[PDB]
Design a protein around this nucleic acid. Sequence first.
RNA 1: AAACUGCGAAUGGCUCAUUAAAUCAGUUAUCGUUUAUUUGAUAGUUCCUUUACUACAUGGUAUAACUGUGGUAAUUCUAGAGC
RNA 2: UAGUGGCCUACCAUGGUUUCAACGGGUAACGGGGAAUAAGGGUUCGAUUCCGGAGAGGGAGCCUGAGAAACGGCUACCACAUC
RNA 3: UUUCCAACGGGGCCUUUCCUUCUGGCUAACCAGGACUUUUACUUUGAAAAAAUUAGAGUGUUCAAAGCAGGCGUAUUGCUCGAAUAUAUUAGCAUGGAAUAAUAGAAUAGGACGUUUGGUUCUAUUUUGUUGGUUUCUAGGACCAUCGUAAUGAUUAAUAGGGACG
RNA 4: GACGUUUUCAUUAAUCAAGAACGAAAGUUAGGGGAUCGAAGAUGAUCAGAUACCGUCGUAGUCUUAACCAUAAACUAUGCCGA
Lengths: 260, 188, 144, 17, 155
Amino acid sequence: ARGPKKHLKRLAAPHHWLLDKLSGCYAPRPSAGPHKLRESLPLIVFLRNRLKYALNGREVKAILMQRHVKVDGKVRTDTTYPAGFMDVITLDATNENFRLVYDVKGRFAVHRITDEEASYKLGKVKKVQLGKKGVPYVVTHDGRTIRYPDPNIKVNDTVKIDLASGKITDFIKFDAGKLVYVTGGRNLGRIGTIVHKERHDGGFDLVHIKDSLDNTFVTRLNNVFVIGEQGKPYISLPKGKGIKLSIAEERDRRRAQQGL
Amino acid sequence: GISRDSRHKRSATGAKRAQFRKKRKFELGRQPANTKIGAKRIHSVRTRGGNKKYRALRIETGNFSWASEGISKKTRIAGVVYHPSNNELVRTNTLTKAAIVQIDATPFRQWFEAHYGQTLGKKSKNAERKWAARAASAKIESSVESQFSAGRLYACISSRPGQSGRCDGYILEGEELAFYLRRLTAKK
Amino acid sequence: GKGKPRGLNSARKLRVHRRNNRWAENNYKKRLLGTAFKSSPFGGSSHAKGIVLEKLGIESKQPNSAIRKCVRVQLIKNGKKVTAFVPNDGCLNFVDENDEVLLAGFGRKGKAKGDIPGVRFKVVKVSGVSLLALWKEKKEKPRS
Amino acid sequence: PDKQVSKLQRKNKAKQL
Amino acid sequence: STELTVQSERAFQKQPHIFNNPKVKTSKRTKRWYKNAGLGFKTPKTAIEGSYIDKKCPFTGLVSIRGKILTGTVVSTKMHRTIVIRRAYLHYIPKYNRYEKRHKNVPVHVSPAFRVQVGDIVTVGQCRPISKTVRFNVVKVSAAAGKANKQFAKF
RNA sequence: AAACUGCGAAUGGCUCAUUAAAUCAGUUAUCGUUUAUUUGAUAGUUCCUUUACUACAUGGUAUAACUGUGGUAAUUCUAGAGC
RNA sequence: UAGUGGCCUACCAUGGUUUCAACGGGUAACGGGGAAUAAGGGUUCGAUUCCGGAGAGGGAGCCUGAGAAACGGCUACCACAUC
RNA sequence: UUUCCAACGGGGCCUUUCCUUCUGGCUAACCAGGACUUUUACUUUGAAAAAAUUAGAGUGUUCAAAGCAGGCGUAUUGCUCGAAUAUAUUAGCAUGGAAUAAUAGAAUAGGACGUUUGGUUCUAUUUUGUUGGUUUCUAGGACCAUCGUAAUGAUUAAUAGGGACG
RNA sequence: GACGUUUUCAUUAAUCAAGAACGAAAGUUAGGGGAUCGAAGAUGAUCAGAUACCGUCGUAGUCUUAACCAUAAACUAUGCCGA
């Protein structure tokens, strides 16, 4: 329809933004950049209505035209900026700093963090390739093009990328035992030490994956996200640790535990 | 608007398709280049993404390359002597992809007489080995040799002079010169 | 075998079988040929307004025994001439010919309430004003 | 001859009316 | 038909950019590029040791295999270098909880390496679009005739 | 202020006449393709002789608005010169 | 062409679809969740706040541009129709 | 929970019930490796199935229809719960299930158990000596001369049909 | 067709879209006889519509030959193979 789109209707947002059905007509459509449109979570969906530091849009831009907030070591100032998965948000406020990693619900939350791990970020190396002048390089999941990597690093691994300058420090291979995190599909926000791979020449590569409570589930491999070992995450994961409690046992936790 | 849409066709059962939407700009086809010999005005055109295409109507001179040796020379043609698709095209002397042409010898033989020490047609003590240590290496094919006396060889074209601006011939030799000389005596 | 195929490849027959037996149903053929659109002078509507042609001549398709004060009318959306009817009958005094009505059926698309041919449509609202607050002796009840 | 009043997509021709 | 020395067309069929070296003449005597087809396909031994060219052969030419692979039986080999298969299947109708026999004709290009007969069993793979109808290319011939070479010479 | 320049004006809003392997829906593929933007990475070789006709202490035009003489029945029409 | 391709074009071959319903005809036919239903199945409707398609009165056509066969853009025809 | 009497389950194995061969980690637990006690139809478990509708916690919007909202003290400058799941067959993509229907091997035995032997296509990871014309033994397929192998192939003659003859 | 058989095929099978044989009476073209009665018809009726049932001759037809037709209350008012 004659080139691109600029508006996103309310109810045409993804459900993980959790906008209210009334009070408006539209959604604050995310700009292009380091993430997908469909799992963006822009700046104003984070600020005004999940942290409530602003009450409406003009007060959001009152922050953003005052150079306070930071998204991964830079001074991003645009309202619809897609700070997506794994992106550290640091404030120049009363200095409380946050990550962007989901709950088990497939939805983002507020997760305040330390300064050991505010300093860096991660990424699924979605491509390793041999570009110009015979230079090997790697392309992670968001946008980064890191030159000259370890040649023993292949596709589907992960890195430990810094935020001051984009330097890979160490990596994680792909095998069993690897503490993992899913980005997409249904079991979004899960965790739990990959069982094994399935090759399926020309097709999807799915993967069998356990959890903490030993509850297997099979994603696709373009959503698997390896970040560890037998109990070794490389960030500070939020309260609840990603393991899916069922809705029978959140009417046993929110109802039978905190409800006396 | 020359569209290259499929929906103006007749589907393979024979059914006539009913009329869908109006014609579109993203599915466009342009005129033939219909590119020829004698001067050069290479009209560039502007395509989807900026991405300019050149179009070598009136192409005159090109980097033609003889494959069994490994040297590539700027050269100029006589004309065409064969065309695979249409035999109209030899009359108009039409250069395209994969036409058959007669190209100038003088870069190739001015290289040959100074590089080989065979000097076919018609610098100190180290540099005679350039002309003497090529034992069983200075032997061109006899059918290749006969084109030198006319001063014009046989070459075919591997370029797109409608869609790149270029003409890059390759000098035909051996098996395939035997086939296109079978056909060339039969058509020229 | 009860006159029908059953085997689990025979559906090819069956949805072509019932396909040729729906036409023996009545309103199916009435509906899917647009016969309500090629006929039925409402044209699939629910009401129509039109001028009264004239007073009506009674042709006995039984039984209501009088000159039933009925109105020859011809519509203006179509122009197709229909005999009409007024309830609360009598009072033949209070509109001229070539004057407005609003028509609506009797309950079966009419077809029978009195000895008058084709009388199937109660008049609802003459000239925009009603009848039920006009048989209520606020206003007055029309003529042909 | 033929009572052939069908094919009335040119019932829209009778937007002449 | 085609008469190997296969250049019965107006233009020399060859492998493009493959270059039979005419200056050096030595014990090579066969410059024939061939590829694996992918997916675990045994290449046909005609293609290794043949003179035909076939641009759209998945073993010698510039096509590829992707996405779909489809079975079926041949019909009507009266075209040139292509066959038509027809796949039978059972459509479903839930009005009657029953099925319905239908078939589909797939016009699929065939290689000269394979040689077929109307009534064999084919396995084809999807390729880039070749003509209007054709999006497939014959890649395995599972002929199941039943060994009637000397079967009539029976006891 | 105006005006040059840039980006925007291809989004939104409306309507459902066309359209029956068409659209569309679920699934595919691009080893067959373009992509402003955003984000990340990316030019010592630019006098193509960098053996110079050089200005890199930075080389030239052309013009709007400004102005000031006008015509049109009427348009967001525009003309002639000087910046 | 941004590119596959009968999308064309030049020579060839005689094919391809079909009673497993080709092809032709009609639709008061824009397609997908909805509705009335309510033992179940079946039935009929879906212009309509969302997705996708199409059009700016009907057909063409082209510029600018990454993007339009755009109409609160342009040229022409056709139907109108203002001072 | 010490637990006597019987009962519902599948497995390790066994009364020809082959549940296989294949060996480095090894002295089959399980991981590469060559064949399946045949291929489709069927079904079972995942995955894809936009959000809005439909079913429902919880929330005194005064009940509601709605809405996803919100509650608590020293209100001492704060504390703090959320915004589930159900569903959506064909088609498409993954694996068993071992009936049903299909497709039939081995009537030539020009076939399997061939752990066999002359001979054919072979052959370079090689070791050759660093790299290419001249070679073998040799890892991995097939058959004729050719026979050694265990238990070597004829599911029926239908109160279903077709013949003959009486 | 039945029946008997320790003969032969080893599933060659049921109905049936399409397709094909046959077909009363009657009727349809070209011939043979032309005995029998006899739709129509030509005559006598014969008195009002006791009721018009009567009676007498009758071309063709009935019988066949080279061919149709394709109709019955073609009805045991019941399609065909199973228990």
